[PDB]
């Protein structure tokens, strides 16, 4: 461990081993000093235009953190293609993390002439929240993960967290956490850090689409032996009175046939078209948004439970806040135009899950009688019902991987709604910070805490290796399957490559469901 010796090598690669695939990626990072080495109470109340739905109380810390919860941090576009075109499923098994070739630099500023030099004796601090004692901030789709392109140098995100609040105030139960109250490893240039983690057992992600629908699982050539009420009134001429007629479901009455299952749960969303002219002329994104109510404040159920984005021949429609939306390279942060973002589609699950913008079904609303016509009610919100089967939201090359399952007495189908793997004990948070280096202190004692520090930042490389277990496809389907493919004809540039400017970009979102499977 010396000043003149590399403390790690560049490991970036992928290797396929039949039923496993191991991804390894390394990136160069930079870490500034955050908050001037201070912890600060942050808050947002109801004053000004601030609405109650956005209030909060918490703290910003001097620490940064590593995040690689994004599939493109591990899979290259080509690897993702290898994965999705040939496997019915996959999931994480274990990972390795390493920090090395650390460099702490100090920057001097005098007469606009700025100079940067090495501070060979400075240290950075690193530690993992192995016992999950800090607010788990990963799994909220935040920016700051390792870049998709290996050659890109990235800046490390600052760590902050929230606790209970009443307006802009804290309450008795509000918690304050100090990260320096954890043991942490201190490294100088020449030292390195690393750890291993094993994923808990979790279901394989379904990287397939059903080639059968719930309502079409019968034999199209045979009648049922079961009968259904088919007639309530006589038909001949005008002397029409009540009667009772029963028939057997068959090939031409599949909608009436007795079945064993029901489509998945439903919470509805308002429909919007990509052809603006077909939309109501008003600003309803929030007012007509599908939300949930929690302790006085409202939140968008975004993207909410998994539902088919649209039905047959309606690709132009989507749930106002029921799909994942990624921006194109350089899309604005606010009010970006439709042509600057990329909408995903969960159309593959029309097969078992209700369409996001329609009713779940119809139920009786009264008791019909000789003098009262039967009335029906539309169900727009439907919770778990015995017999339901459903699919979860798909995952994307540039989407999240896992999320921590909240520590609660109960939960139902703990699959993260944004997509991914729900884990009770997810990869630990890796916090990093530059140790404060005091500038010269006063020459006579003073009780006050020092607030004059040498300006500095650090840089180094980081490696993450993950082993994924694959579930091979076993189909007896005779005809070719749908596959993700690169465009065939000429183009100005190559998709998933760099600019003439050197800017890498991801042209479209790439899902995971190409191969098919029966129900």
The span from the CA of 169 to the CA of 172, in Å, is: 10
Kindly identify the residues of this chain, within the stretch 78-97, that bind a second copy according to CB under 8 A: none
**In 10 A of CB 22, how many CB atoms?**
18
Q: Annotate each residue in 133-162 with x if it binds a second copy (CB under 8 A) or - if it does not, as one string.
A: --xxx-xxxxxx--x-xxxxxxx-xxxxxx
Q: Residues 296-318, buried b or exposed e (16+ Cβ, 10 A)?
A: eeeebbbbbbbbbbbeeeeeebb
**In 10 A of CB 151, how many CB atoms?**
11
Which CB atom, from 205 or from 268, has the smaller least distance to a second copy? 268
SS3 category, 84: helix
Which CB atom, from 197 or from 457, has the smaller least distance to a second copy? 457
Q: How far is the CB of 161 from a second copy (least distance, A)?
A: 7
Which CB atom, from 198 or from 375, has the smaller least distance to a second copy? 375
The one segment of 90-98, 199-207, 293-301, 505-513 that binds a second copy by CB under 8 A: 293-301
Q: Annotate each residue in 239-258 with x if it binds a second copy (CB under 8 A) or - if it does not, as one string.
A: -xxxxxxxxx-xxxxxxxxx
List 16, 132, 182, 197, residue binding a second copy (CB under 8 A): 182
Kindly identify the residues of this chain, within the stretch 437-476, that bind a second copy according to CB under 8 A: 437-447, 449-450, 453-455, 457, 459, 461
List 17, 196, 237, 337, residue binding a second copy (CB under 8 A): 337
In DSSP terms, which residues pair with 128 in a beta bridge? 430
The span from the CA of 68 to the CA of 485, in Å, is: 26
Residue 423 makes contact with a second copy by CB under 8 A: no
**Strand positions, DSSP E, 73-172:** 87-110, 113-118, 124-128, 154-155, 158-163
Does the annotation list 415 as a binding residue? yes
Which CB atom, from 189 or from 512, has the smaller least distance to a second copy? 189
Q: Annotate each residue in 36-55 with x if it binds a second copy (CB under 8 A) or - if it does not, as one string.
A: xxxxxxxxx-----xx-xx-
CA 88-145-428 angle, 5° bins:
80
- Displacement of CA 374 from its chain's centroid (Å): 45
Number of residues that bind a second copy (CB under 8 A): 310
Instruction: Provide CB contacts within 8 A for 200, sequence distance 6+.
Output: 423, 424, 425
Q: Annotate each residue in 103-132 with x if it binds a second copy (CB under 8 A) or - if it does not, as one string.
A: x-x-xx-xx-x-xx-xxxxxx-x-x-----
* Cα-only R_g, the chain: 29
Residue 490 makes contact with a second copy by CB under 8 A: yes
Does the annotation list 130 as a binding residue? no
Asked whether 372 and 366 are in contact (CB, 8 A), the reply is yes
Pairing of strands 421-423, 402-404: parallel
The span from the CA of 417 to the CA of 241, in Å, is: 52
Kindly identify the residues of this chain, within the stretch 424-443, that bind a second copy according to CB under 8 A: 435-443
Residue 8 makes contact with a second copy by CB under 8 A: yes
List 46, 130, 194, 274, residue binding a second copy (CB under 8 A): 274
SS3 category, 247: strand
Q: Annotate each residue in 359-398 with x if it binds a second copy (CB under 8 A) or - if it does not, as one string.
A: xxxxxxx-xxxxxxxxxxx-xxxxxxxxxxxxxx-----x
* Cis peptide upstream of residue 468 (ω within 30 degrees of 0): no
Q: How far is the CB of 110 from a second copy (least distance, A)?
A: 5
Q: How far is the CB of 482 from a second copy (least distance, A)?
A: 18
Residues forming the annotated binding site for AMP?
Answer: 415, 422
């Amino acid at each position: 461990d010396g000043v003149g010796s590399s403390s790690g090598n560049w490991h970036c690669d992928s290797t396929w081993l039949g039923d496993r695939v191991i991804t390894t990626s390394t990136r160069t990072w930079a870490l500034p000093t955050y908050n001037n080495h201070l912890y600060k109470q942050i808050s947002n109340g109801t004053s000004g235009g601030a609405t109650n739905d956005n209030t909060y109380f918490g703290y910003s810390t001097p620490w940064g953190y590593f995040d690689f919860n994004r599939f493109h941090c591990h899979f290259s576009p080509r690897d993702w293609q290898r994965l999705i075109n040939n496997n019915w499923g996959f999931r994480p098994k274990r990972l390795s993390f390493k920090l090395f070739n650390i460099q702490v630099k100090e920057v001097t500023q005098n007469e606009g002439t700025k100079t940067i030099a090495n501070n060979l004796t400075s240290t950075i601090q690193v530690f993992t929240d192995s016992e999950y004692q800090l607010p788990y901030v990963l799994g909220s789709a935040h920016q700051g993960c390792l870049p998709p392109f290996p050659a890109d140098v990235f800046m490390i995100p600052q760590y902050g967290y929230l606790t209970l609040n009443n307006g802009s105030q804290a309450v008795g139960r509000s918690s304050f956490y100090c990260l320096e109250y954890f043991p942490s490893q201190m490294l100088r240039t020449g030292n390195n850090f690393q750890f291993t983690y094993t994923f808990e057992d979790v279901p394989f992600h379904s990287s397939y689409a059903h080639s059968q629908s719930l309502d079409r699982l019968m034999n199209p050539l045979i009648d049922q032996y079961l009968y259904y009420l088919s007639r309530t009134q006589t038909t001949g001429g005008t002397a029409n009175t009540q009667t009772l007629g029963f028939s057997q479901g068959g090939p031409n009455t599949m909608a009436n046939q007795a079945k064993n299952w029901l489509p998945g749960p439903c919470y509805r969303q308002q429909r919007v078209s990509t052809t603006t002219g077909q939309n109501n002329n008003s600003n309803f994104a929030w007012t007509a948004g599908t939300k949930y109510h929690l302790n006085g404040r409202n939140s968008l159920a975004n993207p909410g439970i998994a539902m088919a984005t649209h039905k047959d021949d309606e690709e132009r429609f989507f749930p106002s806040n029921g799909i994942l939306i990624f921006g194109k390279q350089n899309a604005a942060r606010d009010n970006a135009d439709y042509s600057d973002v990329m909408l995903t589609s969960e159309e593959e699950i029309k097969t078992t899950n209700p369409v996001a913008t329609e009713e779940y079904g119809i139920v009786a609303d009264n008791l019909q009688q000789q003098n009262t016509a039967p009335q029906i009610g539309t169900v727009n919100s439907q919770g778990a019902l015995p017999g339901m089967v459903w699919q979860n939201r798909d995952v994307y090359l540039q989407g999240p991987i896992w999320a921590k399952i909240p520590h609660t007495d109960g939960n139902f189908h703990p699959s993260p709604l944004m997509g991914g793997f729900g884990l009770k004990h997810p990869p630990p948070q890796i916090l990093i910070k530059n140790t404060p280096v005091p500038a010269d202190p006063p020459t006579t004692f003073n009780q006050s805490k020092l607030n004059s520090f040498i300006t500095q930042y650090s840089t180094g490389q980081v490696s993450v290796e993950i082993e994924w277990e694959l579930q091979k496809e076993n189909s007896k389907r005779w005809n070719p399957e749908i596959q993700y493919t690169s465009n065939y004809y000429k183009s100005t540039s190559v998709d998933f490559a760099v600019n003439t400017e050197g800017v890498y970009s991801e042209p479209r979102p790439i899902g995971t469901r190409y191969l098919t499977r029966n129900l």
